[PDB]
Amino acid sequence: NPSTTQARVVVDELIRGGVRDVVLCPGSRNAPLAFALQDADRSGRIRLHVRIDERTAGYLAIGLAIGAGAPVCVAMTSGTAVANLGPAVVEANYARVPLIVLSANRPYELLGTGANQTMEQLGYFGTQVRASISLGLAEDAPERTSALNATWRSATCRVLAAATGARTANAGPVHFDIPLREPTPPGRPAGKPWTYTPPVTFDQPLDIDLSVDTVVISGHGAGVHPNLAALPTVAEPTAPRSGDNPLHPLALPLLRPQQVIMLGRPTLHRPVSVLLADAEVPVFALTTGPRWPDVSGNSQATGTRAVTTGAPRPAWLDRCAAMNRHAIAAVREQLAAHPLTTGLHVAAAVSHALRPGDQLVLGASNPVRDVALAGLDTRGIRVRSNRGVAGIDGTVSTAIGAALAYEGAHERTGSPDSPPRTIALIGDLTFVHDSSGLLIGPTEPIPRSLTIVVSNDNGGGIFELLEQGDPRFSDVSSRIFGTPHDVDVGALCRAYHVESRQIEVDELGPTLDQPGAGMRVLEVKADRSSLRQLHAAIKAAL
Template identity: 50%
Template sequence: MNPSTEHARLVVDELVRCGVTDAVLCPGSRNAPLAFALHAADAAGRVRLHVRIDERTAGFLALGLALRSGRPVPVCTTSGTAVANLHPAVLEASHAGVPLLVLSADRQPELIGTGASQTIDQVGLFGGAVRLAVNAGLDDAAGRRRASIARLVAAATGVTGGPPGPVHLNLPFADPLVPDDAGAGSVGRPGDEPWTRVAPVARQTGPLPLDPVAPTLVITGHGAPEGLLDLPVPVVAEPGSSAWPAAVRTGPWLLGAAPGLRPAQVVVAGRPTLHRPVQRLLADPEVAVHVLADPRGMPWPDVAGSARAVGSLPPLRPDRSWTDRWQAADAAAAEALDKALDDPAAPGGLRLARELVAALPPGAQLVLGSSNPVRDVALAAVPRPGLTLLANRGVAGIDGTVSTAVGAALVHDGPAYALLGDLTLLHDTTGLVIGPDEPRPDLTIVVLNDDGGGIFGLLEQGAPEHAASFERVFGTPHGVDVAALCAAAGAGHVRVDVPDVAAALAPAPGVRVVEVRANRAELRQGHAQLRAAVEAAVAEAL
């Protein structure tokens, strides 16, 4: 057996020993040893292989698989720019704490800088975005190579005490790159233990110095820990937060809506990123801000530099009048909001989010696109238990979201859906391209198509004084025929109106797109009218 083949088989075998169940592969020449080894492991039932032709899409597919399963997932590429195309997924995994394993094939070190084809300096390519980077040479002893893989997986999963996240294994392969024996391809026996067993490190933090009876508000965002569903204080939670099912439905609308709702102290759990009123509250010098320590060891959020302490949540027993005011305000705001959203002229994204979340079957998974979809759910949907909500909020990009949803659907035991904007769909159309021999999920992607970037109409650049330049450089209309796009990619397609969304969610095989058209021209005015209606209702209730 030639050295490259032996090395690749050892790598794949040790990854399986360390708990890897899915792997993503992109075709190439320099990574041929890994391709043969992964194919053999797939044929033997030791790993489920997913092949993609686009490295950026492959990276987000692996991220989606890891995001939903919690297990480390490798993505394997050839050398050169192929590796660089993984950088967006690596950044998302780094900031979201997702155990992504980058396996990059490489030329021998002596060829770096000689002009050899597809050769760059790959060592350290991802900088500080990865938890650990290893350049694995062919000359190392087998035990040392296995130990380094176990160390990488431990770093990716965070069991050694650091935060979980992506790691990079760079693998220089020398010719020959194809097997020269008749072996099945995998080294070792199924069920073997990892070369190095790593015990998880337990983290403990002291309680926050909170006033237990002060008017307290808990704000939760992406990555919030479990155990926040039964708190005696109001909770404003972003979708995807563990606390969202028990959150105040109209919480984002109520922040700043009335003086009687202003807290004396705030506890932040996870990383809130969606709402400007949240950031204004956290920057208020008269509000004491405290942060729950992340159980995974991720850095605590503190954009305004206002956090007074980081720790665990002590018992709280606020005055009943505080929670009563929030409940009364929420009831009034919800009634006003629903009345406004019943009007077909209300913002289409908010109406769609409300209807979609309400219509999802129990046990469903919903992947939310960045920009407006995740915010629309936060602003309009009724929080409910029994759903799994996911979103790429680590760096909150729109790239790779189709592939993330596909990956998450492949490991979810139940109905799988996604809610995306049209630009998010277009940014990752290759995510719809799944080869005939690849595992294919049952996934319904609901796309709000308002022909451009609707979210920008809600920001400063959407103000009337910028109308002359807005449409071309921010609105960016594209005129793409989504039905034709889906047909070209082999995905199903149906176009419906908001009232018909529930019927379109019936289970169907394969990947399909449910397109909902909307008009973004009145989006800014529509949101302003909704806010005015909510604030008027709250003022009357309080």
């Protein structure tokens, strides 16, 4: 049949385009390209992942795409599919993740008259996706076989190109529809894609005088700038570090920089937000994509790289280095002097235990910030986190997807060594949010060396550090911002047959040092009633 010939053409081109992982979910109707995907899965050409939860499936694809950079597909099958994939698609848009959403519309059926179970469309597709491409019904015309193969494969590489940013340098989600009526022509030789897109280089030089007292702030999506490696740099955990001169985030208010070089999209730390908005401080935004950020409209110029003149003052370097030391010492000393265990303690333990080659997945909220407060040195490490829109949803499956993709890349190198560790640090709310992600059937791929560390302070500790955390709200803030839940984390892990251990913070390093089951949850109970005082103590020790 032509529909079944079409499916095998697309899947073949998708494999040629670098798609190593595809996610599906049971639904009202068959998945798009399901049979072509099943054939390729048994052949090992591609790895399928099945989940019941459509929401966690979308974030599973996010992890499968950020773990090694490959485009990943998700196959919608139901009417709830658009709604449940929404959060992952929005994140894919903002985090610039190549996420291809597969659909299978039926043009012989009625649209707009009732329950459109193929697609219940929301409004987010019009604003989030890089492209909406539909293949058109497969003609029963064997004379056109040569031509239909060319256009199907050209359109499939179009979907891939839009998803990976091959020509735009702005990866993101793409909607790909392959229509169907109810109820293999070859590609290019040597496994090359039908339409090849060579490496694209968007270039936007900016003149910057480095003799002016400059601090670098690198956030999500930041590039590597070897000509900025010497500068003091306040780097977010997901920012690749260009050099060896880190500036602690808490030292920034103890300095007066005269200009700021902003790499990527920063989302963390109020000292960062205040400095970038300072009208007396020129801010140069260097990005890898067409977008650039601003705080209060204070971005003076945008580019992709810097053409640097001069060099930083040694007196400015030495005083930045000294404040960096003061902030590092205030954290470690006040943490040691603190009686109770907080998430900041847990983050410091997780950070001392990381080894080069590791993959670190950071949940939103306090964990991704605490890891920066503990001064983690990310060099030699791959650090992921859904900074696109900073949700606490889907983090478990993002970690599972990242682990599966990172390990698959390692196995592909053919190295004899153990698959590298994926270690995740997530809050307790974040864990409860995506507990469904732990349920993985026996037929489905499971990570070989993933450890999810759950710092559990029975609620959202980050709100103790905001205006609602001031003691004048202790009357009221417990219920509406603390949100305690009393969840038995161990019992939840037992229900999903996930190896689980509850340990105290001193035991975390040793436990992570010794491998265990392929997937496991380490729970370290923490306190958040002392969190605001602890941060106040660090500020007072600065």
